[PDB]
Amino acid sequence: MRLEQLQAFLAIAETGSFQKAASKCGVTQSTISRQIQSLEADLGLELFHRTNHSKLTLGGERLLPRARKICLEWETATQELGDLIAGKQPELCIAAIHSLCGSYLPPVLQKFCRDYPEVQLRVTSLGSDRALKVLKDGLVDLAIVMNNRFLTTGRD
DNA sequence: TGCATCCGACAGAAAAATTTTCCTGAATTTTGTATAAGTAGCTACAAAATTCTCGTATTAATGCGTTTTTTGCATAGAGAATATGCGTTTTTTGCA
Numbered sequence A: 001m002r003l004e005q006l007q008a009f010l011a012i013a014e015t016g017s018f019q020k021a022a023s024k025c026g027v028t029q030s031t032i033s034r035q036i037q038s039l040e041a042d043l044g045l046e047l048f049h050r051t052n053h054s055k056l057t058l059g060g061e062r063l064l065p066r067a068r069k070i071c072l073e074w075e076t077a078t079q080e081l082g083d084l085i086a087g088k089q090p091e092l093c094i095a096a097i098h099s100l101c102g103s104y105l106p107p108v109l110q111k112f113c114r115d116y117p118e119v120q121l122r123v124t125s126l127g128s129d130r131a132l133k134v135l136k137d138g139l140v141d142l143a144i145v146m147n148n149r150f151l152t153t154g155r156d
Numbered sequence B: 001t002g003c004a005t006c007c008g009a010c011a012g013a014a015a016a017a018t019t020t021t022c023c024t025g026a027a028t029t030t031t032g033t034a035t036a037a038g039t040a041g042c043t044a045c046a047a048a049a050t051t052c053t054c055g056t057a058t059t060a061a062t063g064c065g066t067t068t069t070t071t072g073c074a075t076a077g078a079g080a081a082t083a084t085g086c087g088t089t090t091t092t093t094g095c096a
Helices: A004-014 A035-037 A068-079 A106-115 A130-134
Strands: none
Touching: A004 A035, A068 A106
16 A cells, blocks of 8 residues: 555556556556556555556545545655644734734834845734643743743753 | 993825927127238448558666665773772660
């Protein structure tokens, strides 16, 4: 089921000479045909045209459900670790408190704008006992509450 | 013509009568005899097929020396953690 035999023999299943698997998938006639000769038995259905000529017998067009769906997951990964940020491109959630959400740092908004202008942002609540809970985990993606709490997370 | 009274054992002999059984037509538990038609199969024949075999051709299979690669390897930093630490703090003692 693995990638090379998956993607190789299947898109084979609509073409061969395994020269078709070597292309698109990558597995050459070497590790494809040899491993697929024994694999032709492991899911339990003849995929290509057993050394014949042109066929779609029981390839992977009907095996990808229990097959491709998986490696489509890492196919999204095969694309890239995202485009902006590796994980959760939008990750800038500010604290909800009654002190300083509004007005003390407009040159920081300047630099954020200078490095990246009008960039969408988000928010969470913390508490300050609950800020503690969710910052020693680091929930509050950006977090500000009396430093006398929330102590754990990474880097001590 | 009106007042009482009463009723609704036994024996012999010949004829009949129920079954039984062999003879005699009647036309069945049925089943018997030959001839000619006809119904169904056997011998023969058709061949171009189709398909079995030997040879050649491409192709797919299978092994390897090597590409890069994934995963196990080590030793370098950091970020508090952990003392001293006073220095500050909480503990512990006697008088009214």
